[PDB]
Amino acid sequence: MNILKHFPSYVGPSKIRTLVIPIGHWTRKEFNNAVQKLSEFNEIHLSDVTPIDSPIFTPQGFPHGKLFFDFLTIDHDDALELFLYDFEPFRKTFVIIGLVNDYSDPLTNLNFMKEKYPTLISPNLVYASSTPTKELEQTIDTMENVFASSPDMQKNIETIMCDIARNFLTALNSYYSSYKHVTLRSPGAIGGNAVLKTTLIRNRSQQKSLGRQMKILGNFQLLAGRYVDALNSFVDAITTLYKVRDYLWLGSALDGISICFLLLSYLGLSYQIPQIVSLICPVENIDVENINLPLLIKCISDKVLYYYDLSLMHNSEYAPQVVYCEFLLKTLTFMTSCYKSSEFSKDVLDNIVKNQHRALSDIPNSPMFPRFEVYFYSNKLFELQLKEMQVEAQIKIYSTMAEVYRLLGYKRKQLFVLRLLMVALLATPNKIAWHPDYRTLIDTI
């Protein structure tokens, strides 16, 4: 397991968060190896999944499309991150896969699973058993949300992950059908003074509602795995949301369409950059081949940061500090990913999506960004008050900045930010349980 070594990805909002749990009588090492190998089939193409009846999430709607997965194990602190699900849905985890080895009844097991996790949408479990009896085999293969594989996860993992996607699409479609008749008010309006307003130390209703609904429709498509229609929805979302001057939601919409740009580039399809984004943000209509994609991404990112800044003086529609900081981390790691090659090629497109770090490499002359723009951008992270948010945000921010500086080759800066991490972890007013990665952290320092 890899706990305090976060390094986000710019396609993270497209990635699907899935919480994994050790049902039964497992050990730490065996479970860690199991989940690590299970986190190797997270590119389930939409071609190999069989279709679904409903149209707006049918896997038989686009020949390409990778349908990422993001397997994780940390139960993030709910009841405070619950509030900002209306603003964007991908924050909420959706599908549970539970590893089980006890030869126990799947029906009662998943019954108690659902009783424990009412909030989550798509539960399912997988048996890591060595030759379970035929009586259990009949019961499990009768039902869909229960599967079985031999220990070490090497029997039918591909088809299993195909089917998990198949149930997940149906479950998300049910969720959206239940969810498409809501007001979708901003998290500031939802919580009042429950989310910090990012204290720095540096005819107007129906159209807004329609724009927000079109946004969330496009965002659900983006998470579901059909992206050309997601782009076509994001265009008419942004153009309608610009005139109503709702800066906060427009920022996330612009972020989403930028993610669409990157991932369609990764899939290697042609697409014109729309006149609306070209008008709202300059480039300094036209095919992607006649423009350098990273500079486009950079100016888009800068403009959405500008809108998040411009959306602070409104008391109940202010962008939450968690979203602001996480987006900043996302752009910073994107810049570091770009700063490894003069050519913006399939290699780095694979790196950014698959999250392989490739520590240390030969520097080619004249990379995309210099090694001062990255540092100057990372200095923006300290401009916001950091020692007031809680430990998840603190550790994620300081750990990814440490990794950023390590890739840039600023060893003593990495030492500085790791020291900041250590004091921040010390100052928490709650007991913390031992992990074998604090060992690695102290050794590295």
């Binding site: 050790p22 049902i23 050990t27 090492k29 194990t73 992990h435 074998p436």
Partner: peptide, 22 residues
């Protein structure tokens, strides 16, 4: 030794491997 002692244990079922806050 703690390093090997924690490697093999009985995990609390129906719970994550490692939670942060109480």
């Amino acid at each position: 030794t703690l390093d090997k002692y924690s490697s093999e244990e009985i995990l609390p079922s129906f719970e994550p491997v490692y939670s942060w806050s109480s």
